[PDB]
């Protein structure tokens, strides 16, 4: 018998019912457990919780929790993207009012694991 999966270390999240489940690892292929993501991350299901599965090739999804960035209101810019949600890795062309721009000569902002880089502001 094989039990390849050990307690899943979930970045930006965790398992539900840790205390009850932790003593039963390692686990066999096919087992799964409900998990949550921290504030601002979501599961591939669009919820902030889902289930993670033990496979031959490890825990799946491989990346259980991804960052979601809210695009902020732009004081002196065009607000087509105000209130929009963007996923980690997403890049944006900030459209600034005439006479205004991103600081220090930037042109785009990216949703990073820790949030917008750099901060979308206009001036």
């Amino acid at each position: 018998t094989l039990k390849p999966c050990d307690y899943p270390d979930i970045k930006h999240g965790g398992l539900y019912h840790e205390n009850m489940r932790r003593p039963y690892f390692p686990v066999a292929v096919g087992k799964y457990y409900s998990y949550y993501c921290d504030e601002h991350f979501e599961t591939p299901s669009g919820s902030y919780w889902d289930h993670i599965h033990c496979t031959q090739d490890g825990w799946s999804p491989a990346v259980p929790c991804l960052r979601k960035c809210y695009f902020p209101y732009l004081e002196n810019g065009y607000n087509q993207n105000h209130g929009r949600k963007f996923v980690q890795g997403k890049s944006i062309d900030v459209a600034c009012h005439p006479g205004y721009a991103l600081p220090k000569a930037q042109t785009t902002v990216t949703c990073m694991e820790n949030g917008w880089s750099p901060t979308p502001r206009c001036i």
């Binding site: 539900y16 019912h17 205390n19 009850m20 489940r21 932790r22 003593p23 039963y24 096919g30 087992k31 799964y32 457990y33 409900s34 949550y36 921290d38 504030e39 601002h40 669009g46 919820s47 902030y48 919780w49 289930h51 809210y70 902020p72 209130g83 929009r84 949600k85």
Partner: protein, 244 residues
């Protein structure tokens, strides 16, 4: 006694379980707003829910809104019904999601129905203070989405330190499963717990976990997560043995 759990302060002559700590029901920096019967309160990770006011061996229902503070502004992430099942030494919470935040716009809510078990708490029976003998049978309730009519039967053999049981009468046929024989084990704090697999028509269809509660291991409370053709569904579990 809903509006009352929300506003009344712990009264000490209240039937237990008296107090439930919201840990899995609310994340580090989010707010959970509960409402019912002309009352309303906000929690609070680590915050205490006054269950003393609620009826035993039944499901208490509240309206809920989950929020986060983004730039001095609260944004709704999820809403629906918050369910609470209360026993004497244990209690659990559940969420019936009716709405979640839109995937593309924070400020838009979308219809989505989901059910999950939140907190499982109470007066944990110490592993090291279990009886060494006997077979305690437990009877109680199993509840899933839209169905708090399920019946739970569970049996613990304290000599063999194993447990095994059954779920019946839930409207959803795929939820009426066997809780296979499983080993009692010590917690990280040495609380008696149980985790095993779930069987439906002899096939492995998920897992289940139970805490043991009460000075005399009077009770059991936990959850099952079952694979259906639609597919994975949660079942709240709460049973107690009969006293004298």
């Amino acid at each position: 006694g809903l509006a009352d759990a929300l506003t009344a302060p712990l009264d000490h002559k209240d039937k237990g379980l008296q107090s439930l700590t919201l840990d899995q029901s609310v994340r580090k920096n989010e707010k959970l707003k509960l409402a019912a019967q002309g009352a309303e309160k906000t929690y609070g990770n680590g915050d205490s829910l006054n269950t003393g006011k609620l009826k035993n061996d039944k499901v208490s229902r509240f309206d809920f809104i989950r929020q986060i503070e983004v730039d001095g502004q609260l944004i709704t992430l999820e809403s629906g019904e918050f369910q609470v099942y209360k026993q004497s030494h244990s209690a659990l919470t559940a969420f019936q999601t009716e709405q979640i935040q839109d995937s593309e716009h924070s400020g838009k809510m979308v219809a989505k129905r989901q059910f999950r078990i939140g907190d499982i708490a109470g007066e944990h029976t110490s592993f090291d203070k279990l009886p060494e003998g006997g077979r305690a049978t437990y009877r109680g309730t199993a509840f899933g989405s839209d169905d708090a009519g399920g019946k739970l039967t569970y049996t613990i053999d304290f000599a063999a330190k194993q447990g095994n049981g059954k779920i019946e009468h839930l409207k959803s046929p795929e939820l009426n499963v066997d809780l296979a024989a499983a080993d009692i084990k010590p917690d990280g704090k040495r609380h008696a717990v149980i985790s095993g697999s779930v069987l439906y028509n002899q096939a492995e269809k998920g897992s289940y976990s139970l805490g043991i509660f009460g000075g005399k291991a009077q009770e059991v409370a936990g959850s099952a997560e079952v694979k259906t053709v639609n597919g994975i569904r949660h079942i709240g579990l709460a049973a107690k043995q009969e006293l004298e």
